[PDB]
Design a protein around this ligand. Sequence first.
Ligand SMILES: [Fe+3]
Ligand code: NA
Length: 54
Amino acid sequence: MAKWVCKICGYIYDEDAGDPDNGISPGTKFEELPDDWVCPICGAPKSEFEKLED
Ligand SMILES: [Fe+3]
Ligand code: NA
């Protein structure tokens, strides 16, 4: 699945990993993260992530 970078801090939202400590099961696509999910490292909103693909 896809990976996304937090443009602020460099955290990778890896769809295969999810974010279980913050309520997101492995395999959750970035689009399906709740609108108010934030980077678990720096707190940036979803808008600040960039999909790692051409
Ligand atoms: Fe971040
Ligand atoms: Na959405």
